Amino acid sequence: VQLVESGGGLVQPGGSLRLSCAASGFTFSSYDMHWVRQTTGKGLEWVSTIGTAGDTYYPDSVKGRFTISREDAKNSLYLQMNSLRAGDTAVYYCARGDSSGYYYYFDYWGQGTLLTVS
Amino acid sequence: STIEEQAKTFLDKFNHEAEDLFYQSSLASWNYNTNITEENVQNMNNAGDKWSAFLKEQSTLAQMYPLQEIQNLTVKLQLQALQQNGSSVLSEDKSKRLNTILNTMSTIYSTGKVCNPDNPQECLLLEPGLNEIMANSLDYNERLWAWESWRSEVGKQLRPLYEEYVVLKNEMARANHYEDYGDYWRGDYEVNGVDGYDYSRGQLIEDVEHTFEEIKPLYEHLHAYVRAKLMNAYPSYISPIGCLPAHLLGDMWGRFWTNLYSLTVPFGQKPNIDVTDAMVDQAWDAQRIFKEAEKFFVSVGLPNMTQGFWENSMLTDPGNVQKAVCHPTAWDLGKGDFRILMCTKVTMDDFLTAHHEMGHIQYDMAYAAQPFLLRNGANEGFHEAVGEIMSLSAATPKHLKSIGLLSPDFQEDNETEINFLLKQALTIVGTLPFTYMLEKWRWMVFKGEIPKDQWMKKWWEMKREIVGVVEPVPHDETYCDPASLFHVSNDYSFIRYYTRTLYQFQFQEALCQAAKHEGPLHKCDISNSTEAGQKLFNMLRLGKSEPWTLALENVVGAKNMNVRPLLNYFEPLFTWLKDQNKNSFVGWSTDWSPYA
Amino acid sequence: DIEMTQSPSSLSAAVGDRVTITCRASQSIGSYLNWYQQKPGKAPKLLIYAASSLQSGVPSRFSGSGSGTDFTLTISSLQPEDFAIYYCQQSYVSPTYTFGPGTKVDIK
Amino acid sequence: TNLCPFHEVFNATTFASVYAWNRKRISNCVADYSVIYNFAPFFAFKCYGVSPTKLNDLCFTNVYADSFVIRGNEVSQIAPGQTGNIADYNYKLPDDFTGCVIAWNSNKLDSKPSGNYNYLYRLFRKSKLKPFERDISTEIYQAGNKPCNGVAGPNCYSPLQSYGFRPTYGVGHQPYRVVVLSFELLHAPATVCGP
Ligand SMILES: *[C@@H]1O[C@H](CO[C@@H]2O[C@@H](C)[C@@H](O)[C@@H](O)[C@@H]2O)[C@@H](O[C@@H]2O[C@H](CO)[C@@H](O)[C@H](O)[C@H]2NC(C)=O)[C@H](O)[C@H]1NC(C)=O
Ligand SMILES: *[C@@H]1O[C@H](CO)[C@@H](O[C@@H]2O[C@H](CO)[C@@H](O)[C@H](O)[C@H]2NC(C)=O)[C@H](O)[C@H]1NC(C)=O
Ligand SMILES: *[C@@H]1O[C@H](CO)[C@@H](O)[C@H](O)[C@H]1NC(C)=O
Ligand SMILES: *[C@@H]1O[C@H](CO)[C@@H](O)[C@H](O)[C@H]1NC(C)=O
Ligand SMILES: *[C@@H]1O[C@H](CO)[C@@H](O)[C@H](O)[C@H]1NC(C)=O
Ligand SMILES: *[C@@H]1O[C@H](CO)[C@@H](O)[C@H](O)[C@H]1NC(C)=O
Ligand SMILES: *[C@@H]1O[C@H](CO)[C@@H](O)[C@H](O)[C@H]1NC(C)=O
Ligand SMILES: [Zn+2]
C-alpha cells in the first residue's frame, strides 16, 4: 500500500489550489479518506473527511471553504482550497481510515506535501 | 433552605420572563421608528406599559431577600438593580406631582418659541432656527439677541417649578437611604466587597477634580489661541486679557467649539482630507460603506455581523412612501437581534458614523452571554468609548490609502496633519470644563450647601474660574440658564461625557502600544493587529459582571482613570500652540464684563 | 472538542531502559484512544489501537495500559530506532478526532 | 427492506417539547442512513462511539429515536458529561452513550411573528435527572420553608416556562429540531439489520 501527494507550492492570500492524493495497493471503493495537516507547535489537525457514499465532513474552522471530492476512475482523491489565509501553512497528509468493530483509526499516511502562503 | 439559594431561584425566573417582555417592547419601538402611524403608537404604548408593570411587580417582590445575608458578588449586583425602590417610597399624591413637573419641563423645552420682538408672524423655534443662527452666523447683536431671547421666555417659566423638583427628588433620595440626589447619580461608580478594587461614591468627587488639574495647561493654551483668532473676527468685542463671551462659541450653550473651525483654521491654503468626491467617482453606496467597515472590524480580530443584520436593518431612507426618523441608532433587541437604523448618504461623516454605530453593535454583541441585568457597559462611559476609538482609526490616512479612496501618493505633510488635530481639539478638549462645571454645580445644588437665593450667583462664578466664558448681559436671580439645556430640563446624568473622553484615549494608547505602532499616536491605525483586538475583547465581554476597575485594568493596566494618554495624543498640537503663543497672553483674569 | 494532554514534555534514556508516557483527557473516553509514532523525516505510523491492542507489524515492546481518562504507553526496552514523537488521539467523538501535543524521546 | 420509519421522525409536522420529547422504539427493517445524510445542511452531526462514515453496515438490536425542539446555544448541551439547564432538568445523556445527535434549524416551520409558546421546558426541580427517564409534572416547586398548598406566589413557582420563538431571532435563539439516536444490544438474536 502506498499513498502519494501532489499539489505543493506557494500561493498569494486569497488564492486557490487543488491538491491530490493517489492511493495504490488496495480497494478505494471500501475504505474512507481523511486530510490531516501538521503545523509546528500546534501539532497535527484533522482537516477533511470523505467516506464511501457521498458524505463530506469538515471542522468548524474550514467550513464552507473546502470542497473535498473523489473520483474512483483512477483512484485519486482531490481537495480544493479557496480563500486561503495565513494560518493554512502546514504539511498535508492523506490518510486511510479503518475499524476493527467500534474502534476507528487511521492506517496509512504516506509522504505528504508542503503548502505556504505569503 | 438558605437565603443564599432563595435569591438564585428568583433571578432565574426573572431572567426568562424579562427577555420576552423586553424584546416585544424593542420590536414595537423599532416598528414605530420605521413607520410613524397611529397603530404603531398604540402597540408601543401597550408593550411599554406591560414592561413597566412587570418591573414594578418584581421590584416589590424582590425586597424579601436581605442584602447582608447574600454573598456572591454576582447575585448581589442583580439584587441591587432590582431592589431600588425609586420614586415609589413617596406618598401617592407626590409621585403624580413629580411626574407632572417632569412632563411640564419636557413640554416647555420642546415647545420653544421666541417670535422676535417684531411682527409676530415670524416665529423661529430651536431646532431648526436658533441652532442654525448660533452655528452659521457672524453678527454680534443678532447672536446676543437670540441667546438672551431663548433664556428669557423659556428660562423664566422653568425655574419656579424646578425648586419643587429639587425638593421632591431630594426627599426621594433620603427615602432610599442615600445622602442626596447627586449621591444617587454617583452610584454607578460605586463598588463594595472586592478587596483592593473598592471605589466609594465620594472618591469620584476627588478623581474628576484630580484629573482636571493637569488638563488646565492644554485647555489654557487652546483658549488663548481661540481668543487670539477670534480677535479679528470681532475686533471691538473681546479683550486679550481674559474670558470670552458665551454667545460666540458656535453653539447655543458652548458645549462644542466645532463651528469656530472656519474662523480658526491653521492654514487655509490646502484643504483637509475629504473623500466625498471619490465616493461619487467610484459609485459608492451605503452597502459598500458598511461592508468596508465590516472588513475593517474583521481585520482587527472581531467577528462578522449576522445575516439578520444585513436583512432586518434599514440603511437607506425609504422615501416619501414611509415616514422614518433619520437618526443613527444601534439596536440590541435581545435574543440575538442586532440592527442599525441610519439614513445613509455619501459623505465622510456618514462613513465615520457607520463606524461609531458598528462599534456599539460589536460591544453589544460581546456581552450577549451575561445575565439580563448585567448586559450593559461596566459603567456609563464605556459604550460610547468602544465606538469613538474605531472612528479615530478609520479617519487615519493610512486606512483610507489602504482601501482606495485617495491617490496613492498623498504626501502626509506635517503642514496638513496639524489641521486635523486642532479640529478634534475643538470638540474633545473644549467640552470637558463645561461638563465638569455643570456636574459640580448640580452636585452642590443637590447637596444643600448652595442656598436657593444663590443658585445663579454661583453658576456664573464657576464659568469664570473653570471655563473662560462670561455672560453678555446681567442675569438676575429669577432666570434659569442651565434649564435651557436639554439635560438639565430632563433627567439625565451629564458626567458620563467626561469620564468617556478620558477613557477613549486611554484605550487608544493601549491598543496602539499593543499593535507595535512606531511614531505619533494620532497616526495610529489598529487594523491588521490581532493582539489589540484580543485585548479589547477581554474587556468587552465582561459587562457589569465585574467592577469597572478590573475591566479598565484588563486593557490599560492602571487601577483608575488617567489623562496622560489624552495629553500625549495632542502633544504635537500642544507644542505648536506653545510655539505660536509666545507673543500672545495665556490665562484669563476674573472678569472685566462685556457690560460696563 | 476534547483536549488531550501528554506528560512528560521530554524524556531521555539509554538503550535498553524502560520509558513510560502518560496521556490525560478532559472527559471520560472509555477505551477509545490510539497511539502514533512520528519518526523524523517521515509520516506518522499506527502503533496501538483500542488503547490496548497490538497493531500487526509494530514490535511487541510497546504496551498500552489504561481505562477511563488517564492512559499510559510503555516501552520496556529502548532501542536506537525509537527517537521520534509519540501522539495519543481520541476516537470517542467523531469525526473531529483530536491529537495530543506529542512527546520527545531523546536517546542519549 | 421494509423502510421502518426514518422519514417520519425527521418529517413530522409537529414535534414535542423539551420536557416531553417523543421516544420511538425503531427496530423493524433495514436501516437506510443515506436519507439521513441528505435533508438539508446540519448544524451538528456528532455521532459518539461509532464513526458516521461506516454506518449502513452494523447489526443493531434496538434503535431509540428521541425528538424535541430547543434553541441554538443549547444544542451543544446534548452530549455525554455536559452540565446545564437542559441536561440537569430536561434531558440527560449517560456518560457511556453510543449513538448520534442531529440538529437542524427550523425557523421557517416552528416560528411565528407573534410568538410560538407551544414549546415548554422545565427550569426548577428539587433534584437532577438520572439518565434516560422522563418527568412530566405541574406541581409548584417549593423554594422556601412555607408550603403553598399548590398555589403560585412568593417562593413558589411553576416549573415550566415557554420559549416564544420569533422569526427575527438570532442563530443562537432560533428553533432547532434535534433527533438523538441511541443504540444497545440484548441477548435476543439480531434480525433488524441489512444483508
Ligand atoms: C492589512 O493587511 C491586508 C493584507 O495584507 C496581507 O497581510 C499583512 C499582515 C501582510 O503580511 C501583507 O504582506 C499581506 O499581503 C492589506 O491588504 C493588501 O494591501 C496591499 C497594500 O500594498 C495591497 O496591494 C493588496 O491588494 C491588499 N490585499 C487585499 C485587499 O486583499 C491591507 O492593506 C492592510 N491594511 C493596512 C495596511 O492598513
Ligand atoms: C422600599 O420601600 C419598602 C416599603 O414600601 C421598604 O420596606 C420597609 O422597610 C422598612 C425599613 O426598616 C421596614 O421597617 C418595613 O417593615 C418595610 N416594609 C414596609 C411594608 O414598610 C424597603 O425597605 C424600601 N427599600 C429600600 C432599599 O429603601
Ligand atoms: C410600514 O410601511 C409600509 C410602507 O408601505 C407598509 O407596507 C407596512 O404595512 C407598514 N407596517 C405596518 C405595521 O403598518
Ligand atoms: C456565583 O454565582 C454563579 C452563578 O451560577 C456561580 O457559578 C458561582 O459559583 C457563584 N459563586 C460562588 C463563590 O459560588
Ligand atoms: C466574514 O465575512 C467575509 C465576507 O462575507 C468572509 O470572507 C470572512 O471569511 C468572514 N469571516 C469569518 C470569520 O467567517
Ligand atoms: C513642518 O515641517 C517643516 C519641515 O522642516 C518645518 O520647517 C515646519 O516648521 C514644520 N511645522 C509647520 C507648522 O510647518
Ligand atoms: C417531507 O415531506 C414533504 C411534504 O410532503 C415532502 O415534500 C418531502 O419530500 C419530505 N421529505 C422527505 C425526505 O421525504
Ligand atoms: Zn453612540
Phi, psi (5° rounding) for residue D125?
-155, 150
Distances (CA, A) of B502 to B158, B257, B382, B390, B565: 33, 18, 10, 16, 8
- Environment class of A16 (CB within 10 Å of its CB; exposed 0-12, middle 13-18, buried 19+): exposed
Q: Which three cell numbers stand for residue D119?
A: 414549546
Q: Which ligand is nearest to the CA of D34?
A: 7
> Are A49 and A32 a contacting pair, CB within 8 Å?
yes
Q: Which residue in B274, B533, B289 sits closest to B403, CA to CA? A: B289
> To 10 degrees, what angle do helices B496-514 and B432-447 make?
140
Q: Which residue in B84, B85, B81, B126 sits closest to B108, CA to CA? A: B126
Catalytic entry in B179, B487, B517, B553? B487
User: Binding site residues of B for Zn(2+), as ranges?
Assistant: 356, 360, 384
The sign of the CA dihedral B265, B267, B268, B273 is negative
Q: What is the resolution of this structure in A?
A: 2.9
* Residue that is written with C-alpha cell 445524510 in the block: D37
> Are B59 and B83 a contacting pair, CB within 8 Å?
yes
- Which experiment gave this structure? cryo-EM
Omega before B397 within 30 of 0, i.e. cis: no
CA distance C83 to C41: 12
Q: Which three cell numbers stand for residue B192?
A: 463594595
CA distance A70 to B563: 62
Protein residue whose Cα sits closest to atom 11 of ligand 5: B304
CA distance B299 to B523: 18
CATH code of the domain in which A93 resides? 2.60.40.10
CB burial string B214-243: b at 16+ within 10 A, e below? ebeebbbbbbbbbbbebeeebeeebeeebb
CA distance A94 to B571: 58
Letter for the amino acid at B310?
W
Distances (CA, A) of B115 to B118, B153, B375, B473: 8, 10, 46, 20
Within 10 angstroms of residue B188's Cβ, the number of other Cβ atoms is 21
CA distance D103 to A52: 23
Hey, is the C-beta of D39 within 8 angstroms of any chain A C-beta?
no
Testing ligand 1's pocket by substitution, the residue of B292, B410, B528 carrying the most ligand atoms inside 8 A of its CB is B528
**Half-sphere exposure (CA, 13 Å, Cβ side) for B539?**
26
Q: What's C56's DSSP letter?
A: B
Q: Which ligand is nearest to the CA of D40?
A: 7
CA distance B482 to B497: 17
Q: Which three cell numbers stand for residue A12?
A: 498569494
> Are D154 and D140 a contacting pair, CB within 8 Å?
no
CA distance B159 to B266: 42
Q: Please state the separation of Cα B588 from the chain's center in Å.
A: 28
- What domain count does chain C have? 1
- Which of B6, B9, B308 is closest, CB to CB, to D170? B308
Q: Which domain holds residue C18?
A: 4-107
- Environment class of B577 (CB within 10 Å of its CB; exposed 0-12, middle 13-18, buried 19+): buried
- Which of B16, B20, B335 is closest, CB to CB, to D170? B335
Phi, psi (5° rounding) for residue D46?
-135, 55
* Residue that is written with C-alpha cell 444490544 in the block: D185
CA distance C1 to D80: 12
Interface test with B, best of D88, D125, D155 (most B CBs within 10 A): D155
Protein residue whose Cα sits closest to atom 12 of ligand 3: B35
> Are D61 and D184 a contacting pair, CB within 8 Å?
yes
- What domain count does chain A have? 1
Classified by CATH at the fold level, domain D22-120+165-184 comes out as: Alpha-Beta Plaits (3.30.70)
CA distance B497 to B487: 12
CA of B31 vs chain D CAs: smallest distance (Å): 13
Establish, for the pair of chains B and D, how many residue pairs have beta carbons separated by less than 8 Å. 46
Q: Which residue in B485, B242, A50 sits closest to D51, CA to CA? A: A50
> Are B431 and B497 a contacting pair, CB within 8 Å?
yes
Phi, psi (5° rounding) for residue B579?
-65, -40
D 159-188 → A contacts, CB under 8 A:
none
Q: Which three cell numbers stand for residue B234?
A: 470681532
Distances (CA, A) of B475 to A9, B156, B442, B470: 80, 11, 19, 11
CA distance B256 to B172: 34
CA distance A107 to A99: 9
Within 10 angstroms of residue B88's Cβ, the number of other Cβ atoms is 14
Q: Please state the separation of Cα B177 from the chain's center in Å.
A: 29
- Environment class of D121 (CB within 10 Å of its CB; exposed 0-12, middle 13-18, buried 19+): buried
The secondary structure element, H or E, covering residue B60 is helix B38-61
CA distance B14 to B53: 14
Distances (CA, A) of C19 to A92, B3, C71: 30, 55, 14
Q: Which three cell numbers stand for residue C102?
A: 506529542
CATH code of the domain in which C67 resides? 2.60.40.10
Compute chain D's Rg from CA coordinates: 19
- Which phi-psi region, left, alpha or beta, contains residue B232 (left: φ > 0; alpha: ψ -120 to 50)? alpha
CA distance A86 to D108: 38
Task: Provide CB contacts within 8 A for D153, sequence distance 6+.
Answer: none
Distances (CA, A) of B111 to B239, B429, B484, B564, D91: 37, 32, 12, 43, 59
Omega before A59 within 30 of 0, i.e. cis: no
> To 10 degrees, what angle do helices B160-175 and B432-447 make?
70
The three-class DSSP label of residue A79 is strand
* Residue that is written with C-alpha cell 501535543 in the block: C101
Task: Provide CB contacts within 8 A for B560, sequence distance 6+.
Answer: B199, B207, B549, B552
**Ligand 8 centre and the CA of B329: distance in Å?**
7
Domain boundaries, chain D: 22-120+165-184
Based on the residue annotation, tell me whether B487 is a catalytic residue of this protein. yes
Q: Which residue in D181, D175, D141 sits closest to D14, CA to CA? A: D175
Q: Which residue in B310, A113, B210 sits closest to D168, CA to CA? A: B310
> Are B527 and B402 a contacting pair, CB within 8 Å?
yes
Strand order in the sheet with C62-66: C4-7, C19-25, C70-75, C62-66
Q: Return residues with CB closer than 5 A to ligand 8 (ion).
A: B 384
3-state secondary structure D171-182: CCCCEEEEEEEE
Within 10 angstroms of residue B476's Cβ, the number of other Cβ atoms is 6
Q: Which residue in B578, B590, B593 sits closest to B220, CA to CA? A: B578
Distances (CA, A) of A90 to A93, B178, B221, B523: 10, 63, 57, 36
Q: Which residue in B324, D90, D50, D135 sits closest to C93, CA to CA? A: D50
Would strands A9-11 and A113-117 be described as parallel, antiparallel, or unpaired? parallel
CB burial string B558-569: b at 16+ within 10 A, e below? eeebbbebbbeb
Letter for the amino acid at B587?
G
CA distance B107 to B386: 34
* Residue that is written with C-alpha cell 462611559 in the block: B381
Q: Please state the separation of Cα B220 from the chain's center in Å.
A: 23
- Which phi-psi region, left, alpha or beta, contains residue D164 (left: φ > 0; alpha: ψ -120 to 50)? left
CA distance B343 to B318: 9
Distances (CA, A) of C8 to B64, C86, C105, D77: 55, 11, 10, 33
> Are C102 and C87 a contacting pair, CB within 8 Å?
yes
CA distance B495 to B474: 28
Q: What's B545's DSSP letter?
A: S
User: Which positions in chain B touch D145 (Cβ < 8 Å)?
Assistant: 1
Q: Which domain holds residue A21?
A: 2-117
CA distance B308 to D170: 7
The helix, strand and coil proportions of chain C, stated in percent and rounded to the nearest 5, come to 0, 50, 50
> Are D176 and D43 a contacting pair, CB within 8 Å?
yes
